[PDB]
Each structure stands twice: as structure tokens, then as C-alpha cells.
Subunit: 59 residues, 6 copies
């Protein structure tokens, strides 16, 4: 499985490493897929690049 | 957080529901993000639409 | 500009046509980008494939 | 609805804010989905990372 | 490397197999990447789901 | 056709230009799509942003 996770910028490397680990494990348990087959891409978003209800996250 | 998960076709609805819940919880706990802010998209791939090493995963 | 829009299944073809036109106009006007250069991809999600708060939408 | 928009780098924060607002409203009215449910991600592309016809947008 | 290719519906399985092979080789050779590390996802678009210049 | 290619950061501009050209040509000939219609997006990943088996790929 291949997961792409869009998150807001600002997390530490350590936090993102945890995210990759926990999500990968979750995918593995859910689908009975071998952990080694799971790939995760983290894509960071700047605050001014993410909109909710037409408004900036930065705001 | 918005996660898109590409998986091969063949899983049950029950499995996919579990995937959504477990992944959402993992994201929420890892990032200290509100659970309701987490969105998950499951994208199924037909076997003939996924390649590894230039060959079909068939 | 290239837009991919994930939406729940269930809309008519005409509704999706309107979506493409209106989003394309918005992108062109906002960025002063040539309208003819704007590409929009509609990706439909089955209800059992979209989660909000860990629950099916 | 969730929209991801790939655009070339170079726009101001203000332009991108306008983009997010206008695209979100366009999605909302076209699909009659509540505006507050609409998420928009802006993904900026470097000039050297976007190809048309096998040629860089840089040229 | 991971490539996702959006294409209009209508191509044969044979064409899509060729697409995966040729794109994977192009990525591998261009980036000096191990061929087995290359993944390609084909995503088909219905004609009514793809807009250029605001028109279908 | 529209291709998005996720690759690890570290390549030169020249390498990425070659990638775009060769991938665009491969798409064109494989699908018999006019080359001028082919668009390619390169998306670079930092090493700390890519996981295999729950571990950073690095």
C-alpha cells in the first residue's frame, strides 16, 4: 500500500518519524498486508497553502 | 490531515472501514490533531494499473 | 494550473460539468493564468472509501 | 470536497488566499456542498519541476 | 520513485502494460534508480471527469 | 496525460530535466498521445518524509 499524508508544516523530524511508523503499522494491521510492503509519503503544507471553508489555516 | 491511501483491489468493506479508523487514529495520536479534522481517502487500484519494476503487480 | 478534486459519488454529469467550468474560471481569474491552460480532474469517491474523523462519511 | 491545486511558484500570499477562497466557493455552489466542508491544498511547483511536452516550463 | 499517471479511459490493457514498462525504464535510467524501486500507478479518467479550459 | 513523480531530493536540475523529457516521451509513445499534451510534475521528498516498512527509507 502507498499512503500520502498532507500535514501542516511545523512538526519535528521525530514527530514525523512517529507518524510514518504509526500509520504504517495501522495500514499493516487493517489490511493484513506485510509491513515491508507499506510505503508512506509525508507532504507538508505551509499555513498559507491550506484552506478550510475558503479561509486560510494561518488565519 | 488528509491521507490518500492507494491499495490493490480485493479488500472487503469491513477491512477498508477498519483501515480508515485505524489510520485516522494513528494520525490523530501522532500529530496531536483533533480526530474529526482527519480525512482519509481510499483509492483502489486494479491489478493491471499498478506496476513494480516495470511489470504489472498481477 | 492542475486541479484534482475529490468528491463523493452521486452528482450528475451536468453538475460535474458546472464544477469544472466554475473551478477553472476561479483558478484563471485568481492567478491571471490562461484559462486554456487550466486542467481539472474530478475523482469520485465511493461513500465507503472516504473517512472523516475515522468514520465513513 | 477536497481539491489539490498544482500551480507554478511565484504568486503572492494574497493571490493564493484569493485562489483558495474563490475555488472553495466555486466547489461549494457547483456541488451544493456546505462551504465549511471544503478543503483546498495549494501545491507550488518550481519552474524546473513542471514539464509540458517534455520541455521545462522554465523554457 | 513513485509515479501516478492520469490518463483518459479507453486504452487497452496492452497499451497500459507498455506504459508501465516504458515509464518505469525512463525513471530508472534518468535517476540511476534500481528498477524494482520504481512504482507506477495508472489512474483512468472518464471523459466527463477531465476539463481543459473549463470545458470537457 | 498528467504524470506526478515522487522522487527523493538531491538530484540536479539537469537530471530532473532529463527525467521530464524521457518520461514524457515514454508516455507519448506508449499511449500514442501527442507529446504536446503530456504534462509532468516532479514532487521532491525529503529523506525524513519517506517511509518503507514504517522506517525512514534512508
Amino acid at each position: 500500500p502507498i499512503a500520502q499524508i498532507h500535514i501542516l508544516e511545523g512538526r519535528s523530524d521525530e514527530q514525523k518519524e512517529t507518524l510514518i511508523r504509526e500509520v504504517s503499522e495501522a495500514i499493516s494491521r487493517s489490511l493484513d498486508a506485510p509491513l515491508t510492503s507499506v510505503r508512506v509519503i509525508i507532504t507538508e503544507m505551509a499555513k498559507g497553502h491550506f484552506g478550510i471553508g475558503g479561509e486560510l489555516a494561518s488565519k
